[PDB]
């Protein structure tokens, strides 16, 4: 992941952890080979296991999953009906 | 410790170093009174399990018969059957003029009394008084 | 444990940590005096405490538990209904 | 702590680490100002974090907490329903 | 929070965790801005999630929430019908 | 008789190796062992 994408993920930290729905997201992430299944189990157990803690670990770990991790992640957002969040992200990448 | 015991430790040192998890041995030995806290801290300070075992054995090689037994017993008690077996044959026997006398007075402090001497009590007593 | 048994445990690392069920295994291990109870508590807390992390520490620590640790461990597998895993192990020992 | 009390704690090492219940003990220790709260967090994290590892660090660190650390510690044992352990200790101090 | 208030919270540890009702307390705490909402979710998940575990984490975390955290906390107790507990606290502060 | 112990402890310089050819004189050795 390039520095600009990483920086984007940090800038949007608050919004991501506040709004990301994860339970519905795992299938999408798998389909696009963003994470291996055990990686997902680890993220699921991050911290207290709340939605927020999972979300946070997801987006941190996301930075390590490749050059195209960010656009692929936006797509998974789209695929799971999180258009608003995906929209917030995209309009930054472009910005 | 006796040379038999020490040589037994030396012979099997590598096996012992590879397997011993010191945290399950040092406790027993401390309880038994044959390992000190500062030795244990020196052991703990080694970063890996085998390095700790190595340090502990280093320390034990310098100790007495009782210590070897303490070590052996802890090994047996903590399920290290094979390791204890290696150390079994090397186990040392453990446990007016008395013990004190030859204990303290062999420090060079006295030349041994002759082969043949009559006992003069009367004077010795006086010297003891004064 | 002889070098051949140790080597076997390393060769089967991936399969063991992928498939070993531990929660049901502790009683068996105790019955055959493979581990002391505190050793088990330590293994249970290894790493993140996941099944995989426990499994990994188990099989690493297993190498230190005696000349017969491996065959005794296969038996415990058998005793807890992990025949497939025990079978994978045995057919190697023999091989 | 005098040498006799320290020696007592070493002599009873095996029994203390085998039997000491710690989770219930912290409140008592605090009440009698035996440890500061951060000291307790450190002891809680000692080694693997098992009951035994916590117990061990507790009793080691106890040697540094004052002239009356041992009798105060026996009392905390009493206060938390560890009479058997407290009893083992007291009958030594006296012995 | 001054040392005297902190000390009070430690002295009353047993009574607080035994008697504090939390489910009804969150609104009050929010109203007086004692905790942020995510902080509350974290406290809710503390330990096993029982009333006692939540209560304990609440009162520990309370020590960090300001110079007036203790009196504000007594008020929230009052506001939720926990007068007996608030009363136990106040008569100490004053004592 | 010669065993592990023997070459273990006695190789410390403590003894020169017995010659290539020697008859065994038991009678005296025993006496020395007694005294």
Swiss-Prot record, chains A, C, D, E:
Role according to the record: Involved in the activation cascade of caspases responsible for apoptosis execution. Binding of caspase-9 to Apaf-1 leads to activation of the protease which then cleaves and activates effector caspases caspase-3 (CASP3) or caspase-7 (CASP7). Promotes DNA damage-induced apoptosis in a ABL1/c-Abl-dependent manner. Proteolytically cleaves poly(ADP-ribose) polymerase (PARP). Cleaves BIRC6 following inhibition of BIRC6-caspase binding by DIABLO/SMAC.
Subunit structure and binding partners: Heterotetramer that consists of two anti-parallel arranged heterodimers, each one formed by a 35 kDa (p35) and a 10 kDa (p10) subunit. Caspase-9 and APAF1 bind to each other via their respective NH2-terminal CED-3 homologous domains in the presence of cytochrome C and ATP. Interacts (inactive form) with EFHD2. Interacts with HAX1. Interacts with BIRC2/c-IAP1, XIAP/BIRC4, BIRC5/survivin, BIRC6/bruce and BIRC7/livin. Interacts with ABL1 (via SH3 domain); the interaction is direct and increases in the response of cells to genotoxic stress and ABL1/c-Abl activation. Interacts with BCL2L10.
Phylogenetic placement of the source organism: Eukaryota, Metazoa, Chordata, Craniata, Vertebrata
Domain CARD residues, every copy: 1-92
Protein name: Caspase-9
Post-translational modification comment from the UniProt entry: Caspase-8 and -10 can also be involved in these processing events. (Microbial infection) ADP-riboxanation by C.violaceum CopC blocks CASP9 processing, preventing CASP9 activation and ability to mediate intrinsic apoptosis.
Source superkingdom: Eukaryota
Full-sequence portion shown in this chain: 1 to 95 of 416
Family according to the record: Belongs to the peptidase C14A family.
Tissue specificity statement from the Swiss-Prot or TrEMBL entry: Ubiquitous, with highest expression in the heart, moderate expression in liver, skeletal muscle, and pancreas. Low levels in all other tissues. Within the heart, specifically expressed in myocytes.
Swiss-Prot record, chain F:
Subcellular location: Cytoplasm
Induction, as annotated: By E2F and p53/TP53 in apoptotic neurons. Translation is inhibited by HNRPA1, which binds to the IRES of APAF1 mRNAs.
Domain of life of the organism encoding this protein: Eukaryota
Tissue specificity remark: Ubiquitous. Highest levels of expression in adult spleen and peripheral blood leukocytes, and in fetal brain, kidney and lung. Isoform 1 is expressed in heart, kidney and liver.
Something else known: Physiological concentrations of calcium ions negatively affect the assembly of apoptosome by inhibiting nucleotide exchange in the monomeric form.
Swiss-Prot/TrEMBL domain comment: The CARD domain mediates interaction with APIP.
SUBUNIT field: Monomer. Oligomerizes to a heptameric ring, known as the apoptosome, upon binding of cytochrome c and dATP. Oligomeric Apaf-1 and pro-caspase-9 bind to each other via their respective NH2-terminal CARD domains and consecutively mature caspase-9 is released from the complex. Pro-caspase-3 is recruited into the Apaf-1-pro-caspase-9 complex via interaction with pro-caspase-9. Interacts with APIP. Interacts (via CARD and NACHT domains) with NAIP/BIRC1 (via NACHT domain). Interacts with CIAO2A.
Stated role: Oligomeric Apaf-1 mediates the cytochrome c-dependent autocatalytic activation of pro-caspase-9 (Apaf-3), leading to the activation of caspase-3 and apoptosis. This activation requires ATP. Isoform 6 is less effective in inducing apoptosis.
Name of the protein in its database record: Apoptotic protease-activating factor 1
Origin species: Homo sapiens (Human)
Lineage: Eukaryota, Metazoa, Chordata, Craniata, Vertebrata
């Amino acid at each position: 992941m390039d520095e600009a994408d990483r920086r984007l993920l940090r800038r949007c930290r608050l919004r991501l952890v506040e709004e990301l729905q994860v339970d519905q997201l795992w299938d999408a992430l798998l389909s696009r080979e963003l994470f291996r299944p055990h990686m997902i189990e680890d993220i699921q157990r991050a911290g207290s296991g709340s939605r927020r803690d999972q979300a946070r670990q997801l987006i941190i770990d996301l930075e390590t999953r490749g050059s195209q991790a960010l656009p692929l992640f936006i797509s998974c957002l789209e695929d799971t009906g999180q258009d608003m969040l995906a929209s917030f992200l995209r309009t930054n990448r472009q910005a | 410790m006796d040379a038999k015991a020490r040589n037994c430790l030396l012979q099997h040192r590598e096996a012992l170093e590879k397997d011993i998890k010191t945290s399950y041995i040092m406790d027993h030995m401390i309880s038994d009174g044959f390992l000190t806290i500062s030795e244990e801290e020196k052991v703990r300070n080694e970063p890996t399990q085998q390095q700790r075992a190595a340090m502990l054995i280093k320390m034990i090689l310098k100790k007495d018969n009782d210590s070897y037994v303490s070590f052996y017993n802890a090994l047996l008690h903590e399920g290290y059957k094979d390791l204890a077996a290696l150390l079994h044959d090397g186990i040392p026997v453990v446990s007016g003029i008395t013990s004190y006398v030859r204990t303290v007075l062999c420090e060079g402090g006295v030349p041994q009394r002759p082969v043949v001497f009559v006992t003069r009590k009367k004077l010795v007593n006086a010297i003891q008084q004064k």
